[PDB]
């Protein structure tokens, strides 16, 4: 079913070591199952708890993507739906560590992690922030090839020693009882308890050395079995069946289940991929047709059209060695990957840096370093990859170059670089190029005191967005135009623009943009001194950013909220807001947050309390002595009351 857990079914035959199961089931904190390939760890993890959330890790793994997929799980349970996932769409921090800890502290679901990946310290650093508190309800189990060095505090290290001879003799009899029990004593002379390698011999026939043991079994395979293995071994990720069937231009069913009977291929529900021990031995039997096979798989994932399948197609488009494939792909990266390049930067970074020499890769790498603040490296790469790009990419280079010079207080050089794009979007009449053209043009004028030309450049910008059909970017402009008109002194255009954007946010179920417009709706009514409505919409926006832990805007919400509230409403609610502004002030030291401390004094003076309780003015004014911005916020409090 769509949008569900990847709970892989266990093996048909299994004679678990019951002591190690009671170890895992009654363990505290995190259970570490480390062994060799095919030793039985993954199958043992399934034997522990069936309905546990499974996450099979692959090569490409950004910590934010895993927590995103882990956040999708916590959102499906319903306890971290409002907190975890909605903050994933917000931003990122190490506060994610305490969110997921609080996640299975509330949900209590048991989670299992299979294998090990790159950037292991980032994942190890999260793992060590959860094993120690010992959550009374949740549990996390991992299966690794090595001991992750997580310490022995709240960790149960489980080293799998294969299978007992008595259980192994039972294993062959639980598959073929009529087979002579003497022969099983000789099988232990070959596998030494290895459960997977035992299934290989039980499903085959015919002394060989350990390496030849698998290699002389590799010759027992059929024609289509060797071809299917020698192709599926080139993929480090599980694949669907139609993805496999289109991968061969030939029906792959009969070798699939046959190798499945022998344990060479494992299925995690719907997908299939070879075992890690099978992959390490047959990836060298045929490495000539990698380009053709990878090319077909790129086109299949291109038909999937999902951000994760987007990245999977990017990894194998590097192994084909075609700069033309990377050309057309980065075009589709601006179509749909554009929205989540800020979501998965480190993942996308590792795939792009794999081809640093590619000019188109130098483009998106500069975009990452644009968001990371290193504008020098961005412009540098934007000059190196300048000639090779086409006329379509030539526009996007100068648009980001204009955005690059925008954050350097360089409007003149940003104007002449966006002047280079005045003729490209009109001559090629591309929709996507026309979008980024007027997008950076609005930002160019917004940086200037002028707020007039930005009003018309954003209008024709919306004309392009109404054609593609992406709701997120269409709501972002409607909210932003509902801000330039407010700075112009106009009120009717502002209130109607982010109210229709709220009509958009409510329609598509976007809770992030929904509470962003709530902050714009409350601020607009504050400028008109409509105390009632301005204070209400600020209450729901403040509840959001306090829950999403975006205390910067959460402070801005309760600031105008506490002001407009006491104007015509009760003093206690704004006192609650002011006291919470103190709690988040004493944690983040935000300037406008200490402005709520004196708003508490405003409540105290209006609540019949003395100047000792009105001394809170002096309590935060010495805190607000360095910041000269405090001399500005006083114009709001004395005017309304
Ligand atoms: N108790 C068992 N009984 C029978 N086969 C087993 C048992 N434990 C493991 N196996 C075999 O080993 C395989 C699982 O190996 P495993 O070490 O878990 O792989 P990985 O962790 O690399 O995915 C199973 O598919 C099966 O063939």
Numbering used by the authors: 102 to 307, 314 to 748
What's in the article?
Native crystals of PH0952 lacking its N-terminal effector domain belonged to space group P65 and diffracted X-rays to 3.4 Å. The asymmetric unit contained four protein molecules with RMSD values lower than 0.38 Å among 641 αC atoms. Each PH0952ΔN molecule exhibits a curled up conformation in the shape of the letter G, with 90 × 60 × 40 Å3 dimensions. In the putative nucleotide-binding site, a ligand was clearly visible in the experimental electron density map and was interpreted as an ADP molecule (present in the buffer). The domain organization of the protein is that of a bona fide STAND protein in the monomeric resting state, consistent with the presence of a diphosphate nucleotide. It comprises a NOD module with three domains: the three-layered α/β nucleotide-binding domain (NBD, amino acids 102–262), the helical domain (HD, amino -acids 263–316) and the winged-helix domain (WHD, amino acids 317–393). The NOD is followed by an arm domain (also named HD2, amino acids 394–496) and a sensor domain (amino -acids 497–748) composed of tetratricopeptide repeats. The buried surface area between the arm and the NBD of PH0952 is 490 Å2, consistent with the key role of the arm in the STAND autoinhibition process. Finally, the PH0952 TPR sensor caps the tip of the NBD that is formed by helices ISM (α3), ISMb (α4) and H2 (α5), burying a surface of 360 Å, similar to the NBD–WHD and NBD–arm interfaces. Thus, the NBD is clamped between the arm and the sensor domain, suggesting that in the crystal, PH0952 is autoinhibited by NBD–arm and NBD–sensor interactions.
